[PDB]
Amino acid sequence: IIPIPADSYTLGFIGAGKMAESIAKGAVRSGVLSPSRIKTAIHSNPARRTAFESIGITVLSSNDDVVRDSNVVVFSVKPQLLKDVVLKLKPLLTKDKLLVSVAAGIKMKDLQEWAGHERFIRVMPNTAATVGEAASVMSLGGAATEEDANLISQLFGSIGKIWKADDKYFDAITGLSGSGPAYIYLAIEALADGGVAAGLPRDLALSLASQTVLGAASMATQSGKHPGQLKDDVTSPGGTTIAGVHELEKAGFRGILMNAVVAAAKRSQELS
Amino acid sequence: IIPIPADSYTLGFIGAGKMAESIAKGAVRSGVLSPSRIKTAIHSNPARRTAFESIGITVLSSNDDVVRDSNVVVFSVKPQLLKDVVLKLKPLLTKDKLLVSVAAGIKMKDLQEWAGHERFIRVMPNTAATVGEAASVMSLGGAATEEDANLISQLFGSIGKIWKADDKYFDAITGLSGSGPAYIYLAIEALADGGVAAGLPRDLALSLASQTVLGAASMATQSGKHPGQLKDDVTSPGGTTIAGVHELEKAGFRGILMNAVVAAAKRSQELS
Amino acid sequence: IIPIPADSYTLGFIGAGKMAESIAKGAVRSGVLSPSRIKTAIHSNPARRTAFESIGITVLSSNDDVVRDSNVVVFSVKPQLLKDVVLKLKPLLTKDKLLVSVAAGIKMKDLQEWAGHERFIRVMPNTAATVGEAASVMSLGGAATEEDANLISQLFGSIGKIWKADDKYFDAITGLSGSGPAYIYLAIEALADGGVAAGLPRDLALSLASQTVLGAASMATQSGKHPGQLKDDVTSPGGTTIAGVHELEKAGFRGILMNAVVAAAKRSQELS
Amino acid sequence: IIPIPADSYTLGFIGAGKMAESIAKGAVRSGVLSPSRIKTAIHSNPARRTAFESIGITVLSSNDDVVRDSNVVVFSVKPQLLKDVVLKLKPLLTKDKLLVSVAAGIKMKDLQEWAGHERFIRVMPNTAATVGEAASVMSLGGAATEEDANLISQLFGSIGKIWKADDKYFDAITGLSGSGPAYIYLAIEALADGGVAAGLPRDLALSLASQTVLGAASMATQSGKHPGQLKDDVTSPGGTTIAGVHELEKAGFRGILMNAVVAAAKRSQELS
Ligand SMILES: NC(=O)c1ccc[n+]([C@@H]2O[C@H](COP(=O)([O-])OP(=O)(O)OC[C@H]3O[C@@H](n4cnc5c(N)ncnc54)[C@H](O)[C@@H]3O)[C@@H](O)[C@H]2O)c1
Ligand SMILES: NC(=O)c1ccc[n+]([C@@H]2O[C@H](COP(=O)([O-])OP(=O)(O)OC[C@H]3O[C@@H](n4cnc5c(N)ncnc54)[C@H](O)[C@@H]3O)[C@@H](O)[C@H]2O)c1
Ligand SMILES: NC(=O)c1ccc[n+]([C@@H]2O[C@H](COP(=O)([O-])OP(=O)(O)OC[C@H]3O[C@@H](n4cnc5c(N)ncnc54)[C@H](O)[C@@H]3O)[C@@H](O)[C@H]2O)c1
Ligand SMILES: NC(=O)c1ccc[n+]([C@@H]2O[C@H](COP(=O)([O-])OP(=O)(O)OC[C@H]3O[C@@H](n4cnc5c(N)ncnc54)[C@H](O)[C@@H]3O)[C@@H](O)[C@H]2O)c1
Ligand SMILES: [Cl-]
Ligand SMILES: [Cl-]
Ligand SMILES: [Cl-]
Ligand SMILES: [Cl-]
């Protein structure tokens, strides 16, 4: 377990997919990595080659070469393909290379078994990586060092926010930050529909819906306030806001969102 | 005649409130205005005076003086106080000065009647002005010019996004972008409570909830995609996301949000 | 595994039922097959004799002879009868003949085991085959070739649309395209009942209901748009459409249809 | 009242919109008339010019000229613009010219008052005009003749189906065939979501959903059967279909669609 050179390490992606692309772009954009320090290899899809090459990244001809040339290897294939991919690469997965998985639903215990060592970090990002606003969580394998963690924190800091948590929380994380964006997509559409139902033009209703949600979440992120206090701040006496909030409460809105997180988390567990 | 000099105009706030402060800070930060080009007056509050003075803004002793010294006058008092305030200032409200109201629920027909002329713009911003992420909409009085509009765009573009709409849409705008942030504060708290119900630590649950909402709304704002399509992009077959979405649909989640916007809009009309 | 001659192959139906009749009529109508290239046999209903004979198709006296004279054999008996039928014919089911099942709920693993070889394609069509608007899906056995697939694509393309999917999706397919037509028959009656409730004559209400459904689905099939975008296109501000849509959303309409598909898919699995 | 020559009349569109374009294309496609017998004029956008010119239709410079050159004039501007457009053209609206409105929500009494005569036909088409599957209904003004009606039937027969009804039914028509497509778009999306919830790939689920609806509506339109008979035909005993239909019936699916039509029809009346 030699420390990974924090300022000069090379990064490899196994699986040149959307998430790999988002991470690469973020890391380049933030200056955490240069394109020359990133490698990947292309599978069945040739559309992908151009996506990486156009960022200045070298696309190699095999996964094996990506691993050989990389200090840090990110596995970003679909979860059901990961075990076979790791097993095939295993002879190259020496302990001087930090391994990372972004695969949804694959536990650290399994990752470590497959690779044959514990210098492994699991991350669960989410779809907003594409715009640099991912909610990501990492868990550390048994031999991942504090410096390894910092390196991954910096890397995933370049596509959003990143927190640390024990692996046993990941089903619930998956139901909240992994699946949650869809809940909000429904909400944005419904808010827009609501605006139209109240007489707004569609384009304006949808623009307002998206920015309202963006603004409110920015307030929650930056204000240092409890969401209840934020709600209190905007509910003027007898006003329009409390009229709307009351309709939400009549319908058990909060409990419906709780139900969605719980059901998604339970599904995550069932798929394990 | 008498276009307002786009690069040198002076701006006055009548009502040195939170919203006035947010607009002033934004305009300064963006370089649209310098502090020396902004004036306000404080009705009673010492705390308010230090808030403006600490960003370099001169606090005068009367509303009358703010009006005299300003090319553009923003009325940012509470709506129930606005009529008397405008009536008292009326002799000073000459047609060479562009007037702006941010007052919730006050229609353009009334603003113009109170002032005695039609060189008036109404804006409805929202609470996210504080973090530069307002959703704002403007409507033009009968003598507001295109250059007047541009000036107001630039100004409210400094604190979020700004759109234009007919005054008749404003009750619905109020129920959507004005009131919507509370609906999202509920959502954020509920999502966090869900995460805790699913076994997450509270701090992590809340951090994830807020950033999940922020990221999803950023995807909606940047992607160019319909929210349906964004939901399609994240609902993998038989996966955790579609499980959660299905719970939301069982409960009529979308309709509840529609209800809230509709109720808030109807409250707006009733108050008007 | 000799290629089936694409332009001259003969087709045999085992089970001279309604589905067989719809496939035969389609294939003849489209010019994919001529009647002289199609054979079937009755076992114990001679009324079926006249239905094939009247479209110019020869009706043989035994299933055995249909098989001998055919390059492609379609099994269109009731599912609970299929195994014994295939077992009886087995000595004649040589690998030069492509086998096809349209039997609901019978998996490829079983088809192949019964026949003793893997040159087998499963199709799940639906009721709209009768009017050349089936939604069909095919899965390929282990020895079905790409050319076999193309042949079956062209055949079932004559009674509607035909997609390819893995056999493991067929319970869900059965709940959606197999059972879905009933959901829409309910919808059509309900829309007609709604029109009558709103004061329309029954004959007009039913005509409008059916054609409204037809037109909307044709839009969805041709437009290249997401259904949400299509909904957005027709929901004018504060207008009649959004008022109707809002009543759907209040009631959880979407979730009810999701429930139906999920229940039907589960039932399919249980009947497995 | 001079008959409009049936085989040589010229047709003018006032408002070179989407619906005008659909009608023009349909009529040219079906051979009802040649492009040389059609005229329109262009307003705010010159993008429209090319849409008409590219099908061989002459685009004139004024509404006035379109009217002068046309025996049959179709008004296809947005409803809120129609009154002023008709009043401006009124001196040219001589009784030898058959007038037609496709405007949503504009009653025959008003049309006739604006034009100053009763040789007017109202049509309510729907969004599926774009694919030639409109559900349309016409009503006759007090001086519209049987031959005028036949001419308009033939014309609107080119973009779908066309029925006749008294003007007093048009609110309800609007809530059913006018607004109904959105109810079906919801249904298509929800069906697809259901498929996905049951484990289907999204692309397949959406393809199946759309074609399932199309095919069921085609069965309703062509079979001659009551929808209840059609539902009986596919609900095999104890099978997947009846399981899904039972879930719909548990939830009051039929009533929800009735509610949508009734609400949309009431809204139509309220707007009128
Ligand atoms: N996309 C997201 O928003 C998101 C969020 C959280 C987690 N994840 C995880 O990220 C991973 C990928 O997600 P995606 O959306 O990037 O998938 P994707 O399908 O875009 O990329 C997958 C890539 O892997 C390639 N591949 C397949 N087999 C391979 C092999 N044997 N060797 C090398 N490459 C191979 C595929 O060709 C494809 O390019 C998954 O594990 C998913 O759970 C994604
Ligand atoms: N704050 C928001 O998020 C938000 C959003 C949309 C619209 N608005 C509109 O902004 C306006 C102000 O909102 P706020 O939240 O800034 O109010 P605020 O109460 O923080 O500040 C209002 C100021 O007006 C001062 N005032 C009272 N009487 C006065 C007078 N006669 N002359 C001069 N000043 C006087 C008060 O002392 C106070 O400082 C309201 O009309 C509100 O509807 C605010
Ligand atoms: N009908 C549809 O719309 C539809 C839709 C999807 C799938 N399918 C599948 O199509 C198949 C046939 O459906 P149908 O509706 O045509 O049935 P059907 O009953 O009309 O025809 C079945 C025929 O098989 C004959 N038969 C019974 N035992 C036989 C044997 N041993 N040898 C030869 N013929 C025999 C019967 O006399 C009957 O004529 C079924 O497996 C069904 O699941 C039908
Ligand atoms: N589009 C549909 O599916 C549908 C369905 C039912 C009824 N309708 C009715 O059809 C009519 C048009 O619908 P659309 O969707 O075609 O509208 P659209 O906006 O595409 O076309 C309207 C056209 O009118 C033009 N216009 C504006 N002012 C004008 C003027 N003074 N003189 C001439 N042209 C002018 C606009 O530039 C635009 O090109 C509306 O009345 C609508 O209710 C449409
Ligand atoms: Cl409020
Ligand atoms: Cl998922
Ligand atoms: Cl509408
Ligand atoms: Cl069934």
Residue numbers in the entry:
A (entry chain I), B (entry chain J), C (entry chain A), D (entry chain B): 3 to 274
Authors' account:
The pathway preference appears to depend on nitrogen availability, being the ornithine route preferred under nitrogen-rich conditions. Both routes converge at the generation of P5C, which in the final step is reduced to L-proline by P5C reductase (P5CR, EC 1.5.1.2). Here we report the high-resolution crystal structure of P5CR from M. truncatula (Mt), a model legume plant. The donut-shaped decamer of MtP5CR can be described as a pentamer of symmetric, bean-like dimers that are related to each other by a five-fold NCS axis. The catalytic centers of P5CRs are located between the dinucleotide-binding domain (N-terminal) and the dimerization domain (C-terminal).
Concerning hydride donors, the complexes with NAD+ and NADP+ showed that both coenzymes are bound by the N-terminal domain of MtP5CR via multiple hydrogen bonds created mostly by the backbone N and O atoms of the protein. In the case of NAD+, the adenine N1 atom interacts with Nδ of Asn65. The N3 atom of adenine forms water-mediated hydrogen bonds with the backbone N and O of Ala18 and Ala43, respectively. Additionally, adenine interacts by π–stacking to His45 with an interplanar distance of about 3.6 Å and an inclination below 6°. The O atoms of the pyrophosphate group form strong ionic hydrogen bonds to the peptide amides of Lys20, Met21 and, via H2O, to Gly19 and Ala22. The nicotinamide-adjacent ribose forms two direct hydrogen bonds between O2′ and the backbone NH of Ala106, as well as between O3′ and the carbonyl of Val79. The si-side of the C4 carbon atom of the nicotinamide faces toward the catalytic center. This means that during the reduction reaction, the hydride would be transferred from the pro-S position of NAD(P)H. In the catalytic center of the enzyme, a MOPS molecule was also found in the structures with either coenzyme. NAD+ did not exert any inhibitory effect regardless of the coenzyme used.
